[PDB]
Amino acid sequence: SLSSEALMRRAVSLVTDSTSTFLSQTTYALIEAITEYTKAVYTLTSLYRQYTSLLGKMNSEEEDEVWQVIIGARAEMTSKHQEYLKLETTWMTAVGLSEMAAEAAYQTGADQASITARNHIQLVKLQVEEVHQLSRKAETKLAEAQIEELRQKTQEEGEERAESEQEAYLRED
Amino acid sequence: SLSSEALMRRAVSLVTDSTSTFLSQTTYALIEAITEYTKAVYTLTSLYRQYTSLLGKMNSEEEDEVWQVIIGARAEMTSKHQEYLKLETTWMTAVGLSEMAAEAAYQTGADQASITARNHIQLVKLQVEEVHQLSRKAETKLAEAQIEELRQKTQEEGEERAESEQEAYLRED
């Protein structure tokens, strides 16, 4: 049936282009929320630098208010992280749909659509892995700011502890 | 982002309805192929019944020609069997697509789309298995016709062979 196979191939092109537009919106929402995460990560990094500058006993109206804002930032970042992961779960469903559509296109013989799908899938996956590289960069720089905050905080902590032992030794002993 | 997720939900609704279009197209192509297969099946069935009526020497100058026609019938039926099985593989591919789309619609909260798709799949799968039930009836009746053809051939030619042995024993022995 010439018409039947011709139209069915074309319909699989509809599945491919619908799933492509969907996957594009999904990539865009994913990139958007990845971007918001990246922003929040870099923000938290700067906030770690700020809070680290406030280490040692000083104005809580600075130190612990910066900590409170850090709590707000953490909640924002984490909720957005969970939301981009919700999107990314749907995104893996979308990629899976596009791949299954490309296989339907092959099985029907819309190999031009199968190829265009596979290309679109790869372009999306590449762009996603690239913004994932940005994510890993941001997360590494946040981890570095955590490590600096650890170095400073712990340093001060141990110093104070030593002094506290020396001050406890002042009496009755 | 409620706007983002709502546009996403409509996008997935588009994937779900365009995949429902492809699934409909593939179901119609499948139903067509099933129908033409079932036609060739009932054809070969009746042809076997006719040929069974031609068993023995009664009209070899006809039995051999109905046999020749049966060869073409077998070829057409079997190539259509293989074809509609390729098509049904593609249909199960389309069902898998619509199922992954209904699941993405659920994961996206396009519940109206998800449920519409799920019941569309149920309708399609039932209608397919309805034509498949007709096909399985036809396959049962083809099997029955072949079985009775073999019964009739093995009986009539077995008794004629016994008579041929008895007639060969009449001479020189």
Swiss-Prot record, chains A, B:
Annotated source species: Homo sapiens (Human)
Part of the intact protein present: 67 to 239 of 239
Domain of life: Eukaryota
UniProt protein name: Diablo IAP-binding mitochondrial protein, cleaved form
Reported effect, residue 15 to D: Monomeric. Impairs interaction with BIRC6. Impairs ability to inhibit BIRC6 caspase ubiquitination
Region Disordered, residue ranges: 151-173
Effect of residue 60 to L: In DFNA64; does not increase apoptotic activity compared to wild-type; enhances the degradation of mutant and wild-type protein via heterodimerization; cells expressing the mutant protein show increased susceptibility to calcium-induced loss of mitochondrial potential compared to wild-type, indicating increased sensitivity to mitochondrial stress and suggestive of mitochondrial dysfunction
